[PDB]
Design a protein around this ligand. Structure first.
Ligand SMILES: CCCCCCCCCCCC(=O)OC[C@H](COP(=O)(O)OCC[N+](C)(C)C)OC(=O)CCCCCCCCCCC
Ligand SMILES: CCCCCCCCCCCC(=O)OC[C@H](COP(=O)(O)OCC[N+](C)(C)C)OC(=O)CCCCCCCCCCC
Ligand SMILES: CCCCCCCCCCCC(=O)OC[C@H](COP(=O)(O)OCC[N+](C)(C)C)OC(=O)CCCCCCCCCCC
Ligand SMILES: CCCCCCCCCCCC(=O)OC[C@H](COP(=O)(O)OCC[N+](C)(C)C)OC(=O)CCCCCCCCCCC
Ligand SMILES: CCCCCCCCCCCC(=O)OC[C@H](COP(=O)(O)OCC[N+](C)(C)C)OC(=O)CCCCCCCCCCC
Lengths: 39, 46, 290, 42, 47, 290, 47, 42, 46, 39
């Protein structure tokens, strides 16, 4: 009856985009970090 | 397919031509201007 | 302010792989001939009991009028065996900052592995993007984003995101963010990376110009496999000698002696690996002629 | 505690971890002691 | 079984010495050999 | 008249086996300690990949008040591994004539091979008798009678009769007479033996102190198998170097370097055998310390 | 079949060169290397 | 004579003999030529 | 059997005693008369 | 009906003693040879 067990596959895709935003956020953090540390 | 052929062609050209290309650019420069010419014997032995 | 450029994420993971010894097995001969400072040719003969024996022929070209620095780009290097398996590397500088490397290995008349890498350098930070093993006809392939910033003159922090698509990946796409950092503490350069899966940490310790020591751990959180190494290098120009040897936490022990034999530019390498798990020892010896 | 520690030694990953982190930290102790060492000194 | 226990300790201590001495012959000994030979060379050169 | 003693039949058959190289595999360490001119002790460590790898401990005693010459008999020499396999040799002199050698190899707690041999040295001739692998409980065993006489100062001729008894022999007893001779005009020395069932010939030739060349053929008339070798030795004290290498008519090629490293009594040995039939190379390296 | 005959000759020329040069690397080359190095040492010593 | 000589080459012992006596006499020819040779002469 | 036992005994005595015998005759002679004694460390160290 | 195929075995023994007398005869020959050669 199921068309596809898509949910696990799309949740993995959701975690992939979550990894992307986390990768960006850590770059944003370190891009702020030296000012925050020297401030 | 256009790429179906061109990709195999270009990769075959890289595959066989890269060492030919390095050798060609080498003999294009040759030795230093004061040194004897790079005869192909210099590829074959010391 | 006025920080260094930190390098690149691959140079942190390689940071302690330079002193780790590279053992070989059987008898290997290499002859290098410098035809010009732009053009070098190398003939290498590999005889081994278990490593596939054979000749391979190598040539290197470097330098063109476009590129000013002593790096003397482009670099155009490749070596091929009589069976036709080609290894070749290409390196380019779209500018003084943006640098590019390309490498491909062909065997069985097929490209078995390839990667294209881009490396960009700022006064305080580095950014790089890599693509590897691409399918040309399909979306499938490997992609890696990497970032690294100097945060204090003794400390750098950064980030990495590897990605893959297609049938080689268990999920149709997967990616792994992983933090990276390095702390210098003078000699005691710490390095490591913490992933959403896996961990790696170098320790590196230059004792003196004559002695360099490092250590590693590796770990994987979905694969449940981990290893470590303790490795050292000795440099003895008083003895025309370098030695790299290390203990493996899987109890391989390796040492790769190499001697320069004279001012005459022969070097002799002796490679010993003992697998103490299997009581197995693999010897290699080989001569390099400059 | 052999009833405890053998339960690690018997289990591959837990032992692989102990081995790997053990030799690593031993390397850290050795390295911090080696910092003054030279083999054929100046 | 005391003798068998001594054969146990013997074979174990034999193996332990084997692993130690083979490992030293790889890791340290090549350095010792060339460093000793270079030191004696310097001695004979300075003698 | 007053001819040389010709040696013994085994010295003819060995005549060109001294320059034939003895290749080895893997890493072998040997330490020799001289405790007195009568007593020497040697520790040997062999790490090897397929050759059995381990340790064996050796000791040698020589000389007693009965024996005057610089040979300083008796000789009492043996070396044992921690598994308990013993090799040992005993040599004795009932006089200057009637010299005796004994050797036994014990492994798996069993005598696997042994021989006892006499030499009687009779001015212009030699007579020798050997017994080997004897059963103690049964008549079975090996016996060899050998005779060799100088016939002219350039030429010697002789004879040999090997014999065996018992279940190891296809006939309940078998023996093979075989003529032997040697000729020595100029630098060249010929040698060989003609049997009822086989033939062997050395050719040997000193070119100079730096270069010695020999050749062999072997043949068997009931086994239908034959081989040959061409082998040479280079001696280069100027290079602290000796090299033995030869072609085998089964197309193995072998070379065994030894380098004395210094007045300090290390010798490196480097052993290469390539089976060109199987494209198979076996490397060995080893250090002897005097 | 000319190309295939050239592939035949070529692969034979591989074996002939392979067997020759591997054999020389065993039999002669170790002598050549050390004899050359000793001669250059004598040259530099005499120079 | 390839019909003749191949009948030897095809047969193991006869070829083993030809190889062994061949390389042997080649060694004799070479050795009788090498008699004057030196490698690092005095 | 008399030999059935004595042969195995004597061969076991050779097997284990030969290196003992060589060592014993060695330490019987010892070092040269002017040299330091052959302590058993001479079996174990350089 | 045969007790033993002894004949081949005894012929081998006969050749063994033949090898012995030949071994002796060649020694006797070489023991005479230098006199015969100088004679
Ligand atoms: C004394 C100082 C100077 C010395 C100078 C030495 C020069 C090198 C001599 C040969 C070394 C050697 O070993 O070559 C050996 C090779 C053949 O080996 P192979 O095919 O691997 O054999 C094993 C066969 N497999 C691999 C299938 C298992 O021969 C050759 O065909 C190369 C000869 C040199 C030609 C260079 C151009 C090659 C272009 C190849 C394009 C596909
Ligand atoms: C981890 C390893 C474990 C195994 C045991 C290791 C022992 C370590 C020894 C240290 C010394 C050392 O390597 O010396 C190697 C020596 C160097 O000394 P030399 O020749 O006198 O030159 C220096 C002169 N000096 C000593 C006065 C300073 O060069 C050789 O032999 C050269 C060999 C050339 C041929 C190479 C092989 C070619 C292919 C195969 C041919 C059959
Ligand atoms: C660096 C200085 C300190 C050295 C301390 C060494 C302690 C060794 C304890 C062994 C425990 C162990 O591993 O025992 C278990 C091992 C075997 O299993 P495994 O190794 O897990 O292999 C399985 C791997 N899997 C898990 C991936 C499947 O047993 C053995 O037969 C091998 C013992 C080899 C010991 C080598 C010691 C080298 C010392 C070098 C000194 C110069
Ligand atoms: C039966 C009577 C034996 C008498 C022995 C007397 C000698 C005692 C010495 C220890 C022997 C031992 O214990 O060595 C044990 C082991 C070998 O063990 P293995 O089992 O063969 O290893 C292989 C395992 N196999 C059998 C399953 C394949 O070798 C060693 O570690 C080498 C010892 C080298 C000592 C060097 C001393 C000089 C150093 C000079 C300064 C650098
Ligand atoms: C500079 C050093 C040169 C070394 C050259 C080595 C060549 C090795 C080739 C192996 C091929 C092979 O397979 O050889 C073996 C087979 C023959 O035996 P088979 O038919 O397999 O029967 C099974 C084996 N039996 C018969 C023993 C049971 O072929 C040959 O004999 C043909 C090879 C001819 C080589 C001629 C070389 C001439 C050299 C002259 C200078 C000395």
């Amino acid at each position: 009856s199921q068309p596809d067990p898509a949910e696990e596959q799309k949740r993995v895709a959701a975690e992939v985009r979550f990894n992307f935003i986390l990768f960006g956020a850590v770059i944003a953090a370190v891009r702020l970090a030296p000012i925050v540390l020297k401030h | 397919d256009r790429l179906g052929f061109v990709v195999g062609v270009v990769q075959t050209g890289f595959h066989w031509g890269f060492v030919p290309l390095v050798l060609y650019l080498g003999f294009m420069k040759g030795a230093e201007p004061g040194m004897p010419p790079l005869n192909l014997f210099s590829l074959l032995w010391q | 302010a006025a920080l260094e450029n930190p390098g690149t994420v691959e140079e942190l993971h390689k940071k302690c792989k330079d002193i780790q010894a590279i053992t070989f097995e059987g008898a290997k001969i290499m002859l290098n001939k410098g035809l010009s400072n732009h053009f070098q040719v190398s003939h290498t003969i590999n005889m081994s009991n278990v490593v596939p024996s054979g000749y391979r022929f190598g040539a290197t070209y470097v330098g063109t009028k476009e590129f000013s620095p002593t790096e003397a780009f482009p670099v155009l290097l490749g070596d091929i065996d009589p069976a036709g398996n080609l290894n070749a590397n290409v390196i380019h500088q779209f500018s003084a900052r943006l640098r590019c490397k390309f490498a491909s290995q062909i065997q069985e008349s097929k490209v078995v592995a390839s990667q294209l890498t881009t490396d960009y350098r700022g006064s305080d930070y580095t950014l790089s993007l890599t693509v590897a093993n691409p399918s040309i006809f399909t979306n499938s392939g490997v992609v890696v984003g990497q970032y690294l910033q100097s945060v204090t003159p003794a400390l750098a922090l950064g980030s990495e995101l590897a990605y893959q698509f297609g049938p080689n990946v268990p999920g149709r796409q997967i990616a792994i963010m992983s933090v990276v950092g390095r702390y210098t503490a003078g000699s005691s350069v710490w390095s490591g990376t913490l992933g959403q899966s896996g961990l790696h940490v170098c320790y590196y310790q230059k004792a003196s110009d004559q002695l360099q020591i490092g250590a590693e751990v590796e770990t994987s959180l979905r694969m449940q496999e981990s290893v470590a190494t303790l490795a050292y290098q000795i440099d003895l120009p008083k003895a025309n000698l370098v030695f790299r040897g290390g203990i493996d936490s899987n109890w391989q022990i390796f040492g790769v002696l190499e001697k320069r034999l004279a001012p005459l530019p022969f070097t002799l390498a002796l490679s010993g690996r003992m697998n103490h798990v299997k009581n197995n020892f693999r010897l290699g010896c080989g001569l390099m002629i400059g | 505690p052999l009833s405890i520690v053998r339960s690690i030694y018997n289990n591959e990953f837990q032992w692989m971890l102990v081995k790997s982190y053990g030799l690593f930290f031993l390397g850290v102790r050795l390295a911090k002691e080696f910092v003054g060492v030279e083999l054929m000194p100046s | 079984a005391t003798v068998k226990s001594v054969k146990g300790f013997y074979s174990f201590s034999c193996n332990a010495s084997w692993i130690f001495f083979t490992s030293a012959v790889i890791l340290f000994a090549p350095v010792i050999f060339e460093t000793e030979r270079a030191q004696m060379e310097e001695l004979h050169k300075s003698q």
